[PDB]
Amino acid sequence: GLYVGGFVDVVSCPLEQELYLDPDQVTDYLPVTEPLPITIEHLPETEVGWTLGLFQVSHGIFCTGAITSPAFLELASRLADTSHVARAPVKNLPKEPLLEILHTWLPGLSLSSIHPRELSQTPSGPVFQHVSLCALGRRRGTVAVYGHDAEWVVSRFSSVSKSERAHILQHVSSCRLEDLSTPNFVSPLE
Numbered sequence: 066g067l068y069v070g071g072f073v074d075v076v077s078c079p080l081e082q083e084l085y086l087d088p089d090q091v092t093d094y095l096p097v098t099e100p101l102p103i104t105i106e107h108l109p110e111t112e113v114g115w116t117l118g119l120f121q122v123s124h125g126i127f128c129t130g131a132i133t134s135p136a137f138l139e140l141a142s143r144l145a146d147t148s149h150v151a152r153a154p155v156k157n158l159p160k161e162p163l164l165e166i167l168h169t170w171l172p173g174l175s176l177s178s179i180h181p182r183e184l185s186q187t188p189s190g191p192v193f194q195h196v197s198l199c200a201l202g203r204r205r206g207t208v209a210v211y212g213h214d215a216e217w218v219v220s221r222f223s224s225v226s227k228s229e230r231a232h233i234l235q236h237v238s239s240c241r242l243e244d245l246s247t248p249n250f251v252s253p254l255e
């Protein structure tokens with residue numbers, strides 16, 4: 066059970082190729098402490114985990130999540146330890162290969178929102194749908210950090226204050242990971 070943390074691009078996932086929202090268009094609807102699915106590249110069949118919180122902080126919208134899919138963790142761990150392809154774009158001989166592989170191959174966190182037309186009015190249903198781990202499409206700076214404890218993960222971001230991290234982590238620790246439903250990811254290898 067891994068944690069992920071980082072700053073999100075907020076996107077609408079539209080006939081358009083892409084719409085990147087300014088964070089101030091959605092901050093009225095934060096924080097979100099109920100679990101949203103975490104998927105790969107906005108694919109609904111690639112659920113790998115669950116969000117733990119979405120928070121407005123000074124330097125953007127920060128996401129903390131849990132990567133919990135057994136099939137995904139088993140596959141990513143095996144590739145990290147045995148695949149020269151997965152290791153090719155990472156530094157030689159990392160101490161924590163799984164964490165480095167995810168940091169390199171899935172560096173972008175994106176938060177799916179409804180369209181701004183509804184955000185300015187009064188939305189009827191949920192404003193956010195999922196967070197995705199992304200290999201393309203990154204607009205803002207910083208990248209995702211993966212690690213085995215949420216404190217370490219969030220403390221890697223210098224732009225998150227001591228008090229911001231404490232607010233973020235206040236909720237993260239209150240979440241019990243094993244009682245999260247199993248995400249739907251299946252290994253491509255079958």
Ligand SMILES: O=C(O)c1ccc(NC(=O)c2cccc(CC3CCCCC3)n2)c(Nc2ccccc2)c1
Nearest residue numbers: 105111140141144145151166167170171200253254
């Ligand atoms: O079914 C197929 O034909 C197929 C082909 C390509 C795939 N993935 C890619 O092309 C691809 C590109 C960037 C990032 C990733 C995810 C990342 C997960 C952990 C280890 C390294 C890769 N996948 C995937 N998806 C996938 C691959 C590995 C792990 C998880 C999903 C499926």
